[PDB]
Paper text:
In bacteria, RNAP relies on dissociable sigma factors (σ) to recognize specific promoters and are thus the primary transcription factors. In contrast, σ54 recognizes conserved promoter sequences at −24 and −12 (13–16) and forms stable RPcs that are then fully dependent on specialized activator proteins for transcription. The activation of RPc requires activators that bind to DNA remotely upstream (−100 to −150 bp) of RPc and use adenosine triphosphate (ATP) hydrolysis to remodel RPc. σ54 controls a diverse range of stress response genes, forms a major variant sigma class of its own, and has wide importance for various bacteria. In this study, using both fully duplexed DNA and −12/−11 mismatch DNA, we formed transcription complexes, using the AAA+ domain of phage shock protein F (PspF1–275), an exemplar bEBP shown to be active in vitro without its cognate DNA binding domain, ATP hydrolysis transition state analog ADP.AlFx, the RNAP, σ54, and a native fully duplexed nifH promoter DNA between −35 and +28.
To overcome the conformational flexibility observed in the RPi complex derived from a fully duplexed DNA and to obtain a higher-resolution structure, we subsequently used a DNA substrate with mismatched bases at −12/−11 (mutating the NT strand from A−12C−11 to C−12A−11), which we used previously, and analyzed the structures using cryo-EM. The complete molecular models for σ54 consisting of residues 1 to 477, the PspF1–275 activator of residues 3 to 259, were obtained and helped in interpreting the RPc models above. Notably, we observe that the N terminus of σ54 RI traverses from the side of RNAP, through the DNA strands, to enter the PspF hexamer pore. σ54 RI-H1 is N-capped by P17, which also causes the N-terminal fragment to make a sharp turn toward PspF1–275. Once through the DNA, the σ54 RI N-terminal peptide (RI-N; residues 1 to 14) enters the PspF hexamer and interacts with the L1 loops of five of the six PspF protomers. PspF forms a nonplanar closed ring. The L1 loops do not follow a strict spiral arrangement but track the characteristic hydrophobic residues in σ54 RI-N, with Phe85 (of the GAFTGA motif) in different protomers interacting with conserved Leu residues of σ54 RI-N. The local promoter DNA opening at −12/−11, where σ54 RI-N passes through, is further enlarged compared to that in RPc. The PspF L1 loops interact directly with DNA via phosphate backbones involving several Arg and Lys residues near the GAFTGA motif within the L1 loops (83GAFTGAQKR91). Our structures here reveal that despite the initial DNA unwinding/melting, the RI-H1 and ELH remain in similar positions as in RPc, so inhibiting open complex formation. The positions of RI-N in relation to the hexamer suggests that upon ATP hydrolysis, σ54 RI-N captured by PspF could be translocated further into PspF, leading to the unfolding of RI-H1 and thus releasing the inhibition RI imposed.
Numbering used by the authors:
A (entry chain C): 846 to 945
B (entry chain e), E (entry chain f): 1 to 259
C (entry chain M): 1 to 48, 109 to 477
D (entry chain D): 52 to 151
Write the structure that this text describes.
DNA sequence: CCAGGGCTGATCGTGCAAAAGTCGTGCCAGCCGTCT
DNA sequence: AGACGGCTGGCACGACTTTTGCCAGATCAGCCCTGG
């Protein structure tokens, strides 16, 4: 399946996503140190069978169902600074344009 | 164990004795043939003949020699295998094969084309038959029931009917008493008819019979025993069709002039 | 009528062993095809920085053992430990039953209580409660760890303990009467429970590859977008010249014959593979023409179609198109799809029109998702919504579709606002 | 793959103890071999310790010999280097035996 | 082939010669004609006679002359090959080819159609028979047993029977006697069937008959030979309904009115 | 030496139809929400 | 607390798609043998 940037990253705290906007990019002018997340991307996982365990986990929590993996762009270690500007290029045919 | 009484009445005379005969017939797995006038309730006692007997869940399928048709007659009896003859897209089950472990009703035995009798002559004895254009044979145990309008024994002398065919059938006979042989049940079958017809037409209730009716009912010869009697009473009711004073006139004949 | 053995007329049919092989040839994928074609090529002689990066990675299970090594324990405790954390998933709960693990030890001395110990010791490692053996308790372990000070703790602990069924069927009316909890205050206990990380192992592995090879390509040059096949993917055979120029001058009958037979084969096989390709392009092309629609528009804008629709636009038979469509994937601006896919059942709407089920089933998914979360839309209620659209589907159709999209019922997706 | 490079039943097992086939996947099996798939249930590291062989029905000379500064086949057969280089390519047709 | 043992209850002078006559003939290849009177027991001889003959593991296959359809007549007798006509899909084995090295026992041939007589005659005398549309002739020995109650000599004069067919057909024709003729054997058979009947209907046992009953059943036209006896003892037993006293009720004719 | 006859091989052929499979929609059973 | 209405899902039955299974033959052209 296609990969989309929706800032819906599982297994992460709210403090990390406190600097991420709707589409997932960071606000122009913010700062970032260490290994904070800049662009929240996810990779889809293949569908499975009924899976009573995963079925129960989806009935309880939901919205994840182990479908996506955390593959967000994070800053390499030993790097500290402030973001100047972001940019996004989308090919023809795709018109998602969350905040583009 | 289900009674399946349905519409059984008119138990006043000897008819009650024939009920009392055929009643243990179902358990036995032998030839059984009945003789009665047309419409002498010749089906309803032969159907009952299957439910009472052991396989009461056996599939029921039924045929008449009077219809059938000269052609597909060979195919319809034994049945025909697929691709056996041109235009046979798929294998078709034989009539005999259709009912296995269930009784099959037979009627219009009194007629029977010389062609029809011969084909089914050996089918019911050893219970062995092979589909037309079929490589192999099949074996079945169906309980044949026959019904007639006429005198089979007289016909045997003429030859319009085989002795061998007669022997295979008629393990026991059963002659339904002629309704005009009854004299008692006219009235109870009567009354039942009454009420049904009044019921269907959504009328409130049945008023009675107005003795003149009764008097004239006995006089008629009565060619179809429970099949012109029913009909007579439905067709008389409809002429009155009210809820007041009981009906007096008998529409014995509908091609009579209104005036 | 009558039964007889006469003769009919007017028809057309012909086939042969070699042609047959040429026909089955286009029914199988290029990658799986090129294999079949390599094999031909052995039989026919005239037809033709070391470690880079190699960065060994973490792997979770690998992470679990690194702390096994610096945990202190005995040889038996280190043996069971390798057994336990051997049997643990990417998600992180353990695969095998604990009594099973006892059968893997094969020791009379080993007991369930002993296993309960080594397990639980390594049950709070990294990350939190991993090696769960059926979540309920995994949640209970992560609860376990953090401070009393946070409110609604005992509430979440009561529910999680033995009121799981209550929360999975989302029957909060029953939950309230059973657990005798607060009305629309429990909500926040449940919200605590909600943010506890089910599937805590997943996290480690994230590096997953890119992998799909499109057969055909179709791509919006000025409107009227045009299909071209994949150049790199398409297989190709080329005659060997050496051996072609060594059949005539050949001095023996054995040799000469030998070389003729093979050339014959070979030229034929070329011509047959060449065929495969052309079909498939003609056909690709003919399916996206009709389905012009769909690329811009979306899955909603798909017209309902049958093979007949696309077979009668070409001159080939239906079955032929059916064999060439299987397993080919054609890449487009919108994404990669199988060629099969386009084709679906229709259903009859208002205004005489028909609608592709696929497109309706896409439609149902948007409509159901974009609804008030307090009041879920039931199937029949939707049937009625669609009927406004004109679709006139009926309710079991919609159930079917609604359960196909891997989405559970309305009464089952009801939740607290 | 099946009977090739980076294949199963050769060079050892796969990343985990689980068989390529799908059955017999656990530490409970230490040296057994399944029927649907022939793969020894062992560690992954042993993959770097198992080599393969190729039949090569047709004979083939080793280029490390007879092509270095001293010619081994040359010094064993008292044959010059040019003759051996011409006979190792089906363009010399040397004679083997025959005394009559 | 060493041991065969089923039915053949009768043990009388006449039935002795015929039974021992079958034994002599069975080893011999030549076809035997089974003539007689209805119900004597022809399906006995023909079956038993087939295996006494030296081919018993070989296929054995019956039919009815009258039963096979007239239109496909060629196919029933011989058969087809795939592609012969719009209907067929594969080579068709026929009764004549189904019977290789076994025996074909035609039943009630006396009624076989005019075409049927003119089909089997050439292929029977020799063994040459070409499959419908077949490229080459097919050759086979199918032992021939066939039997019927009619009188062929009287029939040939009439012209309804091909002449010679009665002629290359009849080597060592076997004739059975009637029921009235045996007389001595009648008592044993009655005891047999009865005990059989009574056992079939969840009854304990037989009471036995009386002298009245003995005499009555003894003297009769005894028309249907074996078919009628079993019928009679086997209807009468049903009516008695108990084993407390000896059986005495005789129902000879079913058909003239029971009071 | 030139024309007539024989014989082998080279060449052309991607469909028709029969059975298995899917489709949509209805029928009926079993659970759960709500009023009396 | 009990009945009524709503909901869902399993299973069945026609109308309709789709997927697999066939197996040469005759006909035409060049070359070799032989007659004119
Ligand atoms: N004792 C009975 N009581 C009630 N109805 C009877 C009785 N006898 C016959 N009938 C009715 O009489 C009519 C007789 O049918 P019948 O004429 O015998 O069928 P068939 O013509 O097919 O033998 C029926 O439709 C049946 O319902
Ligand atoms: N000796 C016998 N022993 C046993 N049964 C006999 C004997 N004679 C005749 N039968 C019987 O009566 C019927 C035989 O039919 P059969 O005479 O074949 O009629 P057909 O001669 O007309 O084939 C059988 O049901 C068979 O029991």
């Amino acid at each position: 399946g296609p990969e989309e940037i929706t800032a819906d990253i599982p297994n992460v705290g709210e403090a990390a996503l406190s600097k991420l906007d709707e589409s997932g990019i960071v606000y122009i002018g913010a700062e970032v140190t260490g290994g904070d997340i800049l662009v929240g991307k996810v990779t889809p996982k293949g569908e499975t069978q009924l899976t009573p365990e995963e079925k129960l986990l989806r009935a309880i929590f939901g919205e994840k169902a182990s479908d996506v993996k955390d593959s967000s762009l994070r800053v390499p270690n030993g790097v500290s600074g402030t973001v100047i500007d972001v940019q996004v290029f989308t090919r023809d045919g795709v018109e998602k344009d969350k905040r583009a | 164990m289900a009674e399946y009484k349905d519409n059984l009445l008119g138990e006043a005379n000897s008819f009650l004795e024939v009920l009392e005969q055929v009643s243990h017939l179902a358990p036995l797995d032998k030839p059984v043939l009945i003789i009665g006038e047309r419409g002498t309730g010749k089906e309803l006692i032969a159907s009952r003949l299957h439910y009472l007997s052991s396989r009461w869940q056996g599939p029921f399928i039924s045929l008449n020699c009077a219809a059938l048709n000269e052609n597909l007659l060979d195919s319809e009896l034994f049945g025909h295998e697929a691709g056996a003859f041109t235009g046979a897209q798929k294998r078709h089950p034989g009539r005999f094969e259709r009912a296995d472990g269930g009784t099959l009703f037979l009627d219009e035995l009194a007629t029977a084309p010389m062609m029809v009798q011969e084909k089914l002559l050996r089918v019911i004895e050893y219970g062995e038959l092979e589909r037309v254009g079929g490589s192999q044979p099949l074996q079945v145990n169906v309980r044949l029931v026959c019904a007639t309008n006429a005198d089979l024994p007289a016909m045997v002398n003429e030859g319009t009917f085989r002795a061998d065919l007669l022997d295979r059938l008629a393990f026991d006979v059963v002659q339904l008493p002629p309704l005009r042989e009854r004299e008692s049940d006219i009235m109870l079958m009567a009354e039942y008819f009454a009420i049904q017809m009044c019921r269907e037409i959504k009328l409130p209730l049945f008023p009675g019979f107005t003795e003149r009716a009764r008097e004239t009912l006995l006089n008629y010869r009565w060619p179809g025993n429970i099949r012109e009697l029913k009909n007579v009473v439905e067709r008389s009711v409809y002429r009155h069709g009210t809820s007041d004073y009981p009906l007096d006139d008998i529409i014995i004949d509908p091609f009579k002039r209104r005036p | 009528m009558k039964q007889g053995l006469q003769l009919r007329l007017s028809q057309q049919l012909a086939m042969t062993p070699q042609l047959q092989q040429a026909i089955r040839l286009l029914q199988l994928s290029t990658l799986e095809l090129q294999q079949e074609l390599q094999q031909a090529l052995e039989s026919n002689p005239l037809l033709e920085l070391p470690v880079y990066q190699g960065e060994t990675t973490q792997t979770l299970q690998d992470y679990l053992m690194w702390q096994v090594e610096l945990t202190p324990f005995t040889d038996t405790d280190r043996a069971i430990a390798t057994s336990i954390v051997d049997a643990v998933d990417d998600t992180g709960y353990l695969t095998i039953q604990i009594e099973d693990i006892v059968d893997s030890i094969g020791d009379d001395e080993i007991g369930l209580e002993e296993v309960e110990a080594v397990l639980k010791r390594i049950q709070r490692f990294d990350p939190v409660g991993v090696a769960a053996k059926d979540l309920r308790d995994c949640l209970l372990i992560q609860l376990s760890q953090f401070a009393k000070e946070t409110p609604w703790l005992e509430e979440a602990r009561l529910i999680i303990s033995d009121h799981l069924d209550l929360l999975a069927n989302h029957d909060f009316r029953t939950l309230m009467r059973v657990t005798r909890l607060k009305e629309e205050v429990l909500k926040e206990a449940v919200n605590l429970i909600q943010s506890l990380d089910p599937r805590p192992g997943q996290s480690i592995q994230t590096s997953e590859p890119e992998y799909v090879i499109p057969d055909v390509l179709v791509r919006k040059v000025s409107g009227r977008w045009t299909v071209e096949l994949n150049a790199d993917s398409i297989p190709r055979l080329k005659i060997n010249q050496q051996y072609a120029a060594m059949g005539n001058s050949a001095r023996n009958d054995a040799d000469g014959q030998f070389i003729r037979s093979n050339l014959q084969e070979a030229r034929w096989l070329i011509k047959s593979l060449e065929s495969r390709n052309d079909t498939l392009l003609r056909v690709s092309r003919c399916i996206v023409e009709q389905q012009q629609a769909f690329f811009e528009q979306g899955e909603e804008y798909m017209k309902p179609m049958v093979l007949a629709d696309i077979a009668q636009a070409v001159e080939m038979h239906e079955s032929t198109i059916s064999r060439v469509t299987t397993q080919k994937y054609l890449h487009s601006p919108r994404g990669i799809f199988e060629l099969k896919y386009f084709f679906s059942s229709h259903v009859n709407t208002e205004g005489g029109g028909e609608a592709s089920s696929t497109a309706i089933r896409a439609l149902v998914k948007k409509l159901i998702a974009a609804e008030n979360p307090a009041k879920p839309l039931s199937d029949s209620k939707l049937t009625s919504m669609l009927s406004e659209q004109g679709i006139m589907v009926a309710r079991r159709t919609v159930a079917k579709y609604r359960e196909s999209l891997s989405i559970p019922p309305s009464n089952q997706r009801k939740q607290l606002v | 793959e099946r009977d090739g490079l980076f294949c199963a039943r050769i060079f050892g097992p796969v990343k985990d103890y689980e068989c390529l086939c799908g059955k017999y996947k656990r530490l409970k099996h230490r040296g057994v071999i399944c029927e649907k798939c022939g793969v020894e249930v062992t560690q992954t590291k042993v993959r770097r310790e198992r080599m393969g062989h190729i039949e090569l029905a047709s004979p083939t000379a080793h280029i490390w010999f007879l092509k270095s500064l001293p010619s081994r086949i040359g010094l064993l057969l008292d044959m010059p280097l040019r003759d051996i280089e011409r006979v190792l390519y089906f363009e010399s047709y040397v004679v083997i035996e025959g005394g009559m």
